[PDB]
Design an enzyme around this catalytic site. Structure first.
Site, PDB file in Angstrom:
ATOM      1  N   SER A 282     -34.808  23.394  52.706  1.00 47.86           N
ATOM      2  CA  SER A 282     -34.224  24.030  53.897  1.00 47.86           C
ATOM      3  C   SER A 282     -32.417  23.385  53.436  1.00 47.86           C
ATOM      4  O   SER A 282     -32.832  22.000  53.826  1.00 47.86           O
ATOM      5  CB  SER A 282     -35.580  23.228  55.004  1.00 47.86           C
ATOM      6  OG  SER A 282     -34.249  23.683  56.162  1.00 47.86           O
ATOM      7  N   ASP A 389     -34.124  29.711  49.915  1.00 50.92           N
ATOM      8  CA  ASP A 389     -34.131  28.209  49.901  1.00 50.92           C
ATOM      9  C   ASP A 389     -35.339  28.459  48.599  1.00 50.92           C
ATOM     10  O   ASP A 389     -36.397  29.124  48.817  1.00 50.92           O
ATOM     11  CB  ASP A 389     -34.714  27.947  50.713  1.00 50.92           C
ATOM     12  CG  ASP A 389     -33.562  27.230  52.076  1.00 50.92           C
ATOM     13  OD1 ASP A 389     -32.773  26.500  51.569  1.00 50.92           O
ATOM     14  OD2 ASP A 389     -33.807  27.905  52.905  1.00 50.92           O
TER      15      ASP A 389
END
Ligand code: HEM
Length: 399
Positions: A282, A389
């Site tokens: 993240s 991501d």
């Protein structure tokens, strides 16, 4: 100004720009999808400053907030939960749900976390792999965090599998927008009904606590409770799935370190710490806008200008972590925190739960399946798209 988000350099690697920027231009300007310019901060010390400076805001309706896509711009219109709040509103609402995620509470959850991991591993054993590889993601990495957070929220056992699939559909890269928004609506509708029920007979779950301690006294209403429940579900679940899959793939790439984990499962905590530093799954959540002019390094960030602080880059910062691009579960750790979970007031509410889950997984997985192997060549692992991501979409294994 280069376009941002940057693309990852390859499947498992961070964008290449970060290392160059850390060395030559650590606070720089980038161009966002709508043509607006934001400041990009790349060094560990500056990321910590961005995460704690009281001159910076997370309120998304302030001028200059750096939205990265068009959906984020319209999501900004919704009534905010605590993820998008500044003090003192931030901790007023966050404290309503923090009790479940404290280190003490997570310690008490540890038998349940272990039983969840044991049950799903044993299911996978019984399914076996006699007819070809099985997808570790579908069979194991997806249900483990899904079942746990759904259970903490208050979902009954029989609804877990359907709701797990719906949440996966939300973030699956090959879902159309209609499939993803339908899955999204399905989740919100289910949560509204569970909130109505718990308002009438509370049980011992997070939704019940919100209903009894906050909704009924009128500190929030039931639609806020739905939004908060929804945030706790979607904020970290896809990330947890990716971290589990990435840990398996990473261990397949470092045979010597997998051999140490097999011979000493108690190294699982240190493997998890290095996993969360090395694979910063993240990396786009530390965003701010400046309430006042603020100086960061040798740059002046003016009021109403947006800032993105890369904890991914900070976790590879040569000035903090020696040999940052080597995966080394036996590294010596400096005094500075790795920033896989953020920093400051907004630091991931579920850091302890997430680490306990990851530690339980990697202290158990190879005791159960000592011959677990990635079934495809490591160069052919299906990573998430390079513009997203880091993560793994599917992972065929045999055992
Ligand atoms: C490996 C797993 C996870 C990682 C790497 C991760 C990472 C992060 C990061 C980087 C942030 C931004 C923090 C900041 O602004 O400084 C964050 C915030 C947050 N995460 Fe996680 N997370 C994980 C799992 C979870 C889980 C399992 C949940 C919920 C059950 C969760 C819920 C949240 C929430 C609610 C926030 C916002 C906190 C706030 O602004 O006060 N995360 N997480």
């Amino acid at each position: 100004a280069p376009s941002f988000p940057f693309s990852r350099a390859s499947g498992p690697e961070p964008p290449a720009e970060f290392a160059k920027l850390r060395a030559t231009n650590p606070v720089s300007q980038v161009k966002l999808f709508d043509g607006s310019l934001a400041w990009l901060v790349t060094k560990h010390k500056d990321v910590c400053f961005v995460a704690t400076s009281e001159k910076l805001s997370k309120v998304r309706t302030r001028q200059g907030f750096p939205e990265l896509s068009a959906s984020g711009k319209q999501a900004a219109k919704a009534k905010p939960t605590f993820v998008d709040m500044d003090p003192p509103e931030h901790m007023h609402q966050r404290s309503m749900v923090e009790p479940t995620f404290t280190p003490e509470a997570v310690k008490n959850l540890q038998p349940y976390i272990q039983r969840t991991v044991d049950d799903l591993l044993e299911q996978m054993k019984q399914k076996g792999c006699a007819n070809g590889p099985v997808d570790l993601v579908k069979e194991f990495a997806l249900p483990v965090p899904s079942y746990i957070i759904y259970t903490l929220l208050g979902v009954p056992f029989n609804d877990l599998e359907y709701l797990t699939q719906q949440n996966a559909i939300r973030t699956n890269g090959s879902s159309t927008a209609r499939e993803a928004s339908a899955a999204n609506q399905e989740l919100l509708d289910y949560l509204a009904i569970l909130v109505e029920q718990r308002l009438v007979e509370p049980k011992d779950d997070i939704i019940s606590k919100l209903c009894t301690e906050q909704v009924k006294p009128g500190n929030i209403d039931k639609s806020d409770a739905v939004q908060i429940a929804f945030l706790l579900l979607v904020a970290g679940n896809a990330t947890m799935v990716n971290m589990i899959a990435l840990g398996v793939a990473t261990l397949a790439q470092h045979p010597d370190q997998l051999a140490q984990l097999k011979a000493n499962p108690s190294l699982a905590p240190q493997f998890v710490e290095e996993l969360c530093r090395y694979h910063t799954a993240s990396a786009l959540a530390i965003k701010r806008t400046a309430k006042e002019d603020v100086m960061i390094g040798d740059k002046l960030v003016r009021a109403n200008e947006g800032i993105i602080a890369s904890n991914q880059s900070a976790n590879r910062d040569e000035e903090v972590f020696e040999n940052p691009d080597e995966f080394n579960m036996n590294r010596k750790w400096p005094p500075q925190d790795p920033l896989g979970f953020g920093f400051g007031d907004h630091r991931c509410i579920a850091e302890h739960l997430a680490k306990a889950e990851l530690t339980t997984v990697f202290s158990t997985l190879y005791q159960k399946f000592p011959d677990l192997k990635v079934a495809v060549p490591l160069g052919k692992i299906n990573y998430t798209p390079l513009n997203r991501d880091v993560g793994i979409v599917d992972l065929p294994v045999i055992f």
